[PDB]
Structure 1
Amino acid sequence: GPLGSVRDEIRSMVSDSVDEIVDGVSKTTAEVINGRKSIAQYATSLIESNPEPDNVRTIISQPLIKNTFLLVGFGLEKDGSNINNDPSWNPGPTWDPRVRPWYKDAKNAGKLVITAPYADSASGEILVSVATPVKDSATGQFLGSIFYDVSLAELAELVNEVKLFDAGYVFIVSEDGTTIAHPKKEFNGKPMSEFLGESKINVDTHQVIINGKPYAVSFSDVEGEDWYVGVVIDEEIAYAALDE
């Protein structure tokens, strides 16, 4: 039969509970992301002060860096050489950093950016990178760019700390609805409509039907990036968890 009698009050408590999850995780996410950008910028400044390869290796090979990012690499405009923090890393024999998304985004913007999701050269896996240009301290000339890789699997884990008891999940999308981080990596870098049905962001908690079932969906902006933290919650389970 149908879902039966449902308190117009309890389903506003759910509506607000959802708003609260997204708003809070979005603050949390902005802080963690800001933290990692700050570490990237510091390393980059140290490198600019003296970009000798041995100095670069020292700066990027410390535990803090190796623990904060998947991989770090500084590509040179001059010859497409690179200095990186993982001797096991092989992006391929003819790889030129100068053509890559992290490199071009940092060059094009002349400042620190985080890339849209893109396919890793070595593994093909989708990730993002913090990326920064490196300028000649004397002349201001562009010398190359540095990437700092960020695991989307790990971002997904981070935003799903919140305890939802299989009632729903948290994810991250960009302003245009491209998925930044989903519990199912298969969606990373794809339109959020692939799992939500809807393609456009509507921040206010609202009902969405997915395979015939009602879900409460809400979003909240992330300060510092054109990103939103989103949540999708089985409305029936949510209502039921509460009712009781």
Structure 2
Amino acid sequence: SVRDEIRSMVSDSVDEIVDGVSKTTAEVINGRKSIAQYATSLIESNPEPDNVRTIISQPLIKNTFLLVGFGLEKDGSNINNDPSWNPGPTWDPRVRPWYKDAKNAGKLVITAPYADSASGEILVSVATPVKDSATGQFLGSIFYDVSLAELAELVNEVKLFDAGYVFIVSEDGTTIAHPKKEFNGKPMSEFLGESKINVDTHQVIINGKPYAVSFSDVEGEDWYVGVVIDEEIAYAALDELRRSTLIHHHHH
């Protein structure tokens, strides 16, 4: 009954992977949100353009986000942290989804996926409203852009026996991050066949071949981490481990 022991380990492995990655993802994303909130709070204390630039141009900010910009309600001007960035002459921050999301929420949010103004790539942004200390009046919003390809790479650093991959979706099945960039912002049905999240681990047929799919909620956003695993490949990897370990122990 070795086949049984290993098949059981595969099934359990699928669940432990998705649970672990959802915890990892929550930690990373919450960390970035906290950095964004800190920068925003400093800006609210003194929103003078030079001070804004100093706050958003430090290595921590440059390395944590793709791009950061503060758009002003008064005139649609912006202060950003990349002199090379140019969204075109008619760009108005006040009509962008990050700006409206933050304005309407009145607190830090993460946007749904949308197409970047300059690059056209699908991304999400952490977005915060800026209120002046004295009056609490809306001065504008700040975006902190998040690369979805980077997020996909990050969650796939997990060991998966070469048997599949991890992805992130929102509660309605919208793809947040897939190893294949083409699916970002698109319905997960485009790569899973299934359109809605079924949290219980289950089999799915893709390209006429069976895969195990499982999900786990991400605490802090309305996202889930999903995994797609070829259990035949996983079984082989684990069986190899078992045999290799035995042999090695005979001579050590």
TM norm structure 2: 0.92
Identity of aligned residues (%): 100
Is contact 1:208-1:215 (8 Å) kept?
yes
Structure 1 residue 235, shift from structure 2 partner: 2.0
Is contact 2:6-2:238 (8 Å) kept?
yes
Is contact 2:127-2:142 (8 Å) kept?
yes
Gaps of 5+ in 1: none
Structure 1 residue 204, shift from structure 2 partner: 1.6
Is contact 1:172-1:182 (8 Å) kept?
yes
Per-residue CA shift, 1:7-49, capped at 9, x if unaligned? 4553332111100000001101000000000000000000000
Equivalent in the alignment of 1:44: 40
Structure 1 residue 236, shift from structure 2 partner: 1.6
Per-residue CA shift, 1:51-85, capped at 9, x if unaligned? 00011000000011001100000000000000000
Is contact 2:169-2:226 (8 Å) kept?
yes
Is contact 2:103-2:129 (8 Å) kept?
yes
Q: How many residues align?
A: 240
Is contact 2:171-2:223 (8 Å) kept?
yes
CA distance in structure 1 between the aligned counterparts of 2:191 and 2:94, rounded to whole angstroms: 34
The 1:47–1:187 alpha-carbon spacing in structure 2 relative to 1, beyond 3 Å, is same
SS of corresponding position for 1:40: helix
SS of corresponding position for 1:189: coil
More helix by share: 2
CA distance in structure 1 between the aligned counterparts of 2:174 and 2:2, rounded to whole angstroms: 35
CA distance in structure 2 between the aligned counterparts of 1:212 and 1:26, rounded to whole angstroms: 28
Per-residue CA shift, 1:74-115, capped at 9, x if unaligned? 000000000000011001111000000100000010000000
Is contact 1:193-1:199 (8 Å) kept?
yes
Equivalent in the alignment of 2:223: 227
Per-residue CA shift, 1:188-237, capped at 9, x if unaligned? 00000100000110112111111111101111110100001110011221
Equivalent in the alignment of 2:73: 77
SS of corresponding position for 2:160: coil
Gaps of 5+ in 2: 241-252
Q: Which piece of structure 1 moves more, 159-168 or 62-71?
A: 159-168
Structure 1 residue 166, shift from structure 2 partner: 2.8
CA distance in structure 1 between the aligned counterparts of 2:73 and 2:79, rounded to whole angstroms: 12
Per-residue CA shift, 1:151-172, capped at 9, x if unaligned? 0010001000012243100110
Is contact 2:122-2:185 (8 Å) kept?
yes
Is contact 1:214-1:236 (8 Å) kept?
no
Structure 1 residue 242, shift from structure 2 partner: 2.9
Measured on the aligned residues, the alpha-carbon RMSD in Å equals 1.4
Q: Which piece of structure 1 moves more, 234-243 or 159-168?
A: 234-243
Q: Which piece of structure 1 moves more, 84-93 or 159-168?
A: 159-168
Equivalent in the alignment of 2:210: 214
CA distance in structure 2 between the aligned counterparts of 1:165 and 1:127, rounded to whole angstroms: 29
Q: Which piece of structure 1 moves more, 232-241 or 61-70?
A: 232-241
TM norm structure 1: 0.95
SS of corresponding position for 2:227: strand
Structure 1 residue 137, shift from structure 2 partner: 1.2
Per-residue CA shift, 1:97-141, capped at 9, x if unaligned? 000010000001000000011000001100010000001211111
CA distance in structure 1 between the aligned counterparts of 2:60 and 2:51, rounded to whole angstroms: 16
Is contact 1:173-1:180 (8 Å) kept?
yes
Q: Which piece of structure 1 moves more, 66-75 or 199-208?
A: 199-208
